[PDB]
Structure formats: structure tokens, C-alpha cells
Design a protein around this ligand. Sequence first.
Ligand code: HEM
Ligand code: HEM
Ligand SMILES: C[C@H](O)[C@H](O)[C@H]1CNc2nc(N)[nH]c(=O)c2N1
Ligand SMILES: C[C@H](O)[C@H](O)[C@H]1CNc2nc(N)[nH]c(=O)c2N1
Ligand SMILES: NC(=[NH2+])NCCC[C@H](N)C(=O)O
Ligand SMILES: NC(=[NH2+])NCCC[C@H](N)C(=O)O
Ligand SMILES: [Zn+2]
Lengths: 407, 411
Amino acid sequence: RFLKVKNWETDVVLTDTLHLKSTLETGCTEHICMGSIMLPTKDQLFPLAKEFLDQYYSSIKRFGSKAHMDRLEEVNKEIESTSTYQLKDTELIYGAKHAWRNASRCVGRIQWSKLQVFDARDCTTAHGMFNYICNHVKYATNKGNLRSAITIFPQRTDGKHDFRVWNSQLIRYAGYKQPDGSTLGDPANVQFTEICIQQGWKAPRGRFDVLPLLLQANGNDPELFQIPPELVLEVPIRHPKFDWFKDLGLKWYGLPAVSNMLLEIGGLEFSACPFSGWYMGTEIGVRDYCDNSRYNILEEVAKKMDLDMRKTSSLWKDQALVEINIAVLYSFQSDKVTIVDHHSATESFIKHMENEYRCRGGCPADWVWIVPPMSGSITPVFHQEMLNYRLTPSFEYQPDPWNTHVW
Amino acid sequence: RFLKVKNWETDVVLTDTLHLKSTLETGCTEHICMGSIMLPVRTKDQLFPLAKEFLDQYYSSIKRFGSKAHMDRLEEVNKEIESTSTYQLKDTELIYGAKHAWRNASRCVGRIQWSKLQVFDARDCTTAHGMFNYICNHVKYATNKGNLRSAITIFPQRTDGKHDFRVWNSQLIRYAGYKQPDGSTLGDPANVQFTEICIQQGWKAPRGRFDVLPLLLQANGNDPELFQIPPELVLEVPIRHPKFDWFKDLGLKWYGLPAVSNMLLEIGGLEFSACPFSGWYMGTEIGVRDYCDNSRYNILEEVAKKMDLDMRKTSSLWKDQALVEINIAVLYSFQSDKVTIVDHHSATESFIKHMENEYRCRGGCPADWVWIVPPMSGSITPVFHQEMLNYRLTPSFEYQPDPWNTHVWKG
Ligand code: HEM
Ligand code: HEM
Ligand SMILES: C[C@H](O)[C@H](O)[C@H]1CNc2nc(N)[nH]c(=O)c2N1
Ligand SMILES: C[C@H](O)[C@H](O)[C@H]1CNc2nc(N)[nH]c(=O)c2N1
Ligand SMILES: NC(=[NH2+])NCCC[C@H](N)C(=O)O
Ligand SMILES: NC(=[NH2+])NCCC[C@H](N)C(=O)O
Ligand SMILES: [Zn+2]
């Protein structure tokens, strides 16, 4: 029942009671752990709503109050009647914040309660979504002093009237397949980059082309929109020592904004809920720049550094990886664009876990995702045992729309 | 039921059926994953079935399933168990068992070598001096003047649980740790408690930074006895850096033979509580963990200073820069001295091939991602991008409590 997690570097032991409120499945069983797997009606709705309202009223210290019973009854009546319901603004904000609070794969949750929530439930068209999104981007970018935010479009109804942002992130670089067979730009987006074209986008076929938004509203087909360049903050990547670095011609965008997830609050599903925060250096420097299936830039940098790339044991890949990551952090900091290094971020997460354990009885966390992609054990989270479980409200994965849409 | 794992860097998808033969529990449930948790006498009643599963596996492996030899063996063991409450493995079965416990070790990234394990049968051993002799032979054989050879020495199995054979050391070779009155620690902090026990048992500690610990061996449930491994049998490597000449001046060195000696080997229900086994090091074990863990030698700062790195702010990644250098030094030193060692790139690449091979020829390969991915440069190694399934198969290596916590001292 009561599980304990130990930090092997500090011997601190925390007891977890919060998992006892877990509602969803993990993918694992008593016989097999799938911890490293990336993707493991009115009757259904009322209990979910009740579970939520119960959490909500408990959070505001009015559990079992008339207000609580009342709201509970109203939603109940509303569900029986409309076959669904609408959250009060207070509930929407609470749900979104807690969905972030419960995101076990996010290392930046110490900032969870500071989320700015933009209620776009009154939106009806793609131009309307473009407008809300532009406002979100400008607000969150804040001239480089990034502020976390989420914009929530209309909840699902019959599934045939769903709002969806086809981009995987609000801001990303295009990817095109060249004759060479090689890939131009970002390989992760090679496909999406084609669906835009299949829709009319005039791709400049460059290495870092900010992609166009492809917005889908109420179920209709999606439409394109170029984000005002003036609203997309970018950072040119240079090294605080290697002047040849700038010659690599590298740059990245300052606003990380996941837009393909689904937010579940009290049984209601918000299929278009783009959210943004700020980068942890390694996401760009290690993953986006050095993944073999991404910009795959290690060799080139090792060459410029003139490292012995003959034998893997010279650790040239590692040496270069470090310098590159030093450059990302140096550049962003140089331009006063918010960014956090993996040491500082992981340290904050440990502090957050302790806070959560003390004030909530636990903190669902996915070690596989929390531990940074470089220098793992020199960060504190590596030595921290973690329990992963699913709590709602939550952010869930959902199929890419172009594999579900009925034109 | 089939389960597929995908490698997100190559899109290669594998199908696992081997997990179906999994009996033991993981620690996880449908509602919770305990994947990052370090540590999540039998009855005749439970023994024969464990023995049969094993013998069935063994006989299938030699292509004699259902043979008369197979049936005769089951009958023989059956009788022996009912007769003596336990049973003895044939030499062939012991070797097969030991090799498969390694093949089944989900946290081991070096398993591509599993079939080549050298097995030393020490089941006729009866005393601590006898254990010391077997252990000296294992170390000399395994060390092979730097050309390391994997090996395991298997002492007598558990009987009533009151006559256990145990190697109290956690590794055959490891450095002493000493807690100083000012609160600092001299040597390896990981071995402080064991060092204290050694001293209490009579070991005269030289109190240095790299003192090789004595073996504390327990035979037949008797009190443990101390023994010094012949210095000439302990191969060590002075650590220096190819470009930094001041690195050598840090006075660092490590032993070349990693030999875990505190695990329990289970084969067909039998429990081998003393089964020291050795392979060769992956550089990061030493360079990242033993040297840079805050709770181990913790040398990151000192190296960083010498490199004159900007240690004012973490975002300078001075820790990351120094970590790479230290790891370059470890690999370089071992290679120069011609002592077997493998870097994490080579090791993980090999593990991916081994895993794929296993899926195709065996139906799977239980693997613990948390342990398999190296403690540095995780995503630039192929294993990071490889989905894995973790489950427990027997024969297997299991954890057991430190003997000093359970031993009934006879005086
Ligand atoms: C404010 C600063 C933030 C930081 C430093 C932070 C950091 C991170 C990091 C490093 C990851 C892994 C990304 C990857 O490997 O692709 C992540 C994942 C995640 N974060 Fe955050 N985060 C922040 C804000 C947010 C916000 C505002 C939300 C939601 C309201 C959120 C929800 C999540 C979720 C659901 C995931 C997993 C996404 C997936 O499965 O791909 N994060 N975050
Ligand atoms: C050929 C050399 C070998 C290499 C390169 C190799 C590499 C590794 C590495 C890097 C780990 C993680 C160690 C740690 O983080 O503390 C490990 C764990 C493990 N290996 Fe191997 N290994 C080798 C040989 C063996 C042999 C001979 C066996 C068994 C006969 C074996 C059984 C295991 C087990 C059971 C674990 C988990 C130990 C624990 O839980 O502390 N390995 N190995
Ligand atoms: C297969 C494995 O699950 C996969 O590569 C995971 C590992 N850890 C990760 N961690 C983070 N933060 N982000 C990722 O995309 C991944 N990918
Ligand atoms: C808490 C966490 O499980 C722990 O620090 C693990 C992580 N991965 C590891 N991986 C290896 N190879 N060895 C270890 O000791 C660990 N320690
Ligand atoms: N810190 C964040 N909010 N990250 C969101 C995911 C961004 C993704 N990891 C990237 O490198 O583009
Ligand atoms: N490759 C091996 N056989 N390793 C055994 C464990 C050694 C242990 N990690 C150490 O650093 O001492
Ligand atoms: Zn699990």
C-alpha cells in the first residue's frame, strides 16, 4: 500500500501515498515492466466528473459543503440532460494546472501553479484559432522572458467536431526529402512538412524554416497560416570560444510549445490544448542537434574541433556533445532568452518532489524521461528512485489527425 | 500474447514472446511502475517443480527433450528430492545454469559474451581457506595478465540456511573506505561499513586511499575468516590522461578485474549464495560512477579546477566537461596498459546486436533500460533509443541481504 522511494546519494527516504489515488493503467504488470516503452457515455462521465469535483472542492477546503453538493448535482443534471457538461472557469484553470502537476514525464513541474490559462472555449474557426495562438505565442515569448501558458480550445462532443492543431509543436523547423536521399531540415517533420505542401504551403526549402500552422476547427478541414515572423523569437547558436561555431549555421527557436496532446479534465476531453514553457538546454543541444535521426550534427562539430574520430574510445562524440550544449546555453543566455541547464533543472525537480511528497503524499515521475540525455548520473535525479503512475486531470497522447480525419 | 518493442532511431520493431515464460514478479502493477526502484529455505513441495522446469529447459537446449535420458534424470531428481529434500546438479547442468543466469540478467549490458563464460565448480569446497584458494585461482585465471576472461566460481548450495557459504565482500577486489573523525572519508565511501567489519575481525588497515580489501570468507555457515589476496595477483592501472600531464598527479588508480561477489545464483530451485563472477569493465563504471558519484571518490571539482573551468555557474557545464576528460583518461590508461576495457559506445552498440539476435533466436531479451543506458551521454548511445521489456527468467542472479545483517555468530 504505502510505498517508499530512496535517493541513493542522500539516503533520504520518502513515502508515497498519492499513488493510491491512481486511476489509469501504466502498461506494466506484475510480470513485465514496460517502463521504457514510449507509448504503452453518460454513465462513464458522471463518475469522472464526480472524482474531479471532489478533488476540486477538497482543494478549496469545501469538501462536502452545500456548494460542493450543489455543483455536483448541477453537473449531474446537466450530464443526464446534455450528455456532457461545461467546467466553471475556476475548474478549467484548476484542471489544467493539475494536468501539468500530474505530468510524470515533465521535469519542470516546480512551476506548475504559475501556469497562465487562456480559455479559448468560445472559438469556432481556424482563423479564430490562429488569433488565439498568435496571442499565446506573444504572451508566452514575452520578449525572451518566457512565461508558461496553455490555450484551451472547445472540448470534444461527438468526435466529429474536434479542434486540432496539426503541428506537433506551435513552432518547429520544416523537413524535406532531397534527391540525394538525405534529408533537408528537420527529419522529424519531413512528413508534416509534406502535408502542408499537400495543402498549398510554399516551402522555402531551407535548413531552419519555421513551419506554418495547420489548424482544424469544429471538425472541418485544416487551414494554413504563417506565424508573424516578428512573433517567433530565434537564437543564433555560437560558442563562447569557437568562433568557427557560428559558421555551422545553427539556430533554434526560443518557445517550446507542445500542441499535439489531449487534456482530460473530469472526463471531458480537450483535443486542442497547446502549452508552452521554456527549454532545458539538453532538449536542443543533445536531442534536436545530436540525435542521429534529427539534425545529426556530431561529426561535423568533432571535425571542426579536430578530434580523433578514428576510435570511439577517444570519446570524441562525448567531447563534442558537451561543447555543443555549452553553446546552446551560452547563446540563449546571451540573447536574454529564458533557458535552464540540466543541472539546475534536475536540482529544482528534486526540491519539487520533496515539496510534493510533503504536501501531497507523492509525485508521479517517469525516471526514463526525467533523467537528462547527457551526464545522467552527475544530475541528482539519476540517483532518485521514482514511482510512475497515472493521475487525472492529465495530458495524454492522441493519434496524429491526418490518420483519423475524414475530409 | 505478443509484445513489440521499437527502436525509435531505426524504426526496427521486434516481437517478444519470451516474456511468456516469465514466472517471477517485477514489482510493478497495472497501476504503478517501479522500474527505477533499485531493489523492488525451500520445501520439497516447491522444489521439484522448479527442478523440472529447469531440467525441461536444459534437455530442450541439448535437443534431447523427451528422451529416455531426460525422463531418467527427472525420475532421479524426483527420488533424490523426496529422499534428501534437495538434489545435486550434474556438471553439465551447472554450466548451462550459470551461463543462462548471465543470459537472463536484465541489468547486464555485456551479455553478448554469455555463452563464453568459464565456470569453476567449487561445490566440493568445505572451508574458508578452501574458498580463498578457489578465489585466488579464479582471479589469476580471469585476470590473465590483462587479457581478461569472464568467469564464475560456484561454491556449495544452501541446505538448511544455517550452513551458507558467503563471500562477505561485495566484489573480490575493492578499495577500503575509512570514516575520519572530522567527517571526511578516506578511500572509497561505498566500502566503509565493510572495512569496519574487516578491521574488527583483525585486519590491519594501511589506511590509504586505495587499499585493496582483504577477503572475508564464510564456509558452511561458520564465522568468516580474513585472507589477503596475493598482491601479485591484483592487477591495477595508474590513471593518466593523454593530453593533460597533471592528471597522473591526482594519484588515481583502479583495479582491472570487476568481480561481483555478493549475489545469489538460482538454478532449478537450488540456491548458490556464494557465486563470485567477473568480466571486464565498461569505462563509465569507473570514470562516471566510482570516480564522480558525489557518494564515491567525488573527484569532479578537483579535476575541474586543474582544467581551470568556469565553476561559477552550472550552465558553464564544467561538470560535464570534466566528466568527459576523466572518462577519456580511464579508457586511455587501461588501453595503454593492455588491460581489457570497453567504452560505452562500443558496449551499447554490441548490446543492441546481441538483443536483436536474442529476439530472433530466443523470442526476446529481458532488459532493464534504467541500468542498460550508460550514466553519461545517454542519448548518443543506441540503447537510449531502444524500447525494452523487463521480466525475470530463471536461472538468475538475485540480490541477497548483506551477511553481517543475518549471520548467527558462533564466536
Ligand atoms: C516552464 C518550463 C518547463 C520546463 C523546463 C519543462 C521541461 C520538460 C522536459 C525537459 C520534458 C521532456 C521533453 C522531451 O523530451 O521531449 C517535458 C515533458 C513534458 N512536459 Fe514540461 N516543462 C515545462 C513546461 C510544461 C508545461 C507548461 C506543461 C503543461 C502545462 C508541461 C507538460 C509536460 C508533458 C505532458 C510532458 C511530456 C510530453 C511528451 O510526452 O512528449 N510542461 N517538459
Ligand atoms: C564480459 C564483461 C561484462 C561486461 C562488460 C558487463 C557489463 C555490465 C555493466 C556495465 C553492468 C552494470 C554494473 C553497475 O552499474 O554496477 C553489469 C551488471 C550486471 N552484470 Fe555484467 N558484464 C560483464 C560480465 C558479467 C558476467 C560474467 C555476469 C554473470 C556471470 C554478469 C552479470 C551481471 C549482473 C547480474 C548485473 C547486475 C548487477 C547488480 O545488480 O549490481 N556480467 N554488467
Ligand atoms: C525508447 C525510450 O523510451 C526513448 O528513447 C525515451 C527515453 N527517454 C526519453 N526522455 C525524454 N525526456 N524524452 C524522450 O523523447 C525520451 N525517449
Ligand atoms: C535510483 C536509480 O534506480 C539508481 O540510481 C540506478 C539507475 N541506473 C543505474 N544503472 C546502472 N548501470 N547502475 C546503477 O547502479 C544504476 N543506479
Ligand atoms: N521544455 C519544454 N516545454 N519542452 C517541450 C518539448 C520540446 C522538445 N523536447 C524539443 O526539443 O523541441
Ligand atoms: N563490468 C562488470 N563486470 N561490472 C561489475 C560491477 C562493477 C562496479 N560497477 C564497479 O564500478 O566496480
Ligand atoms: Zn514498470
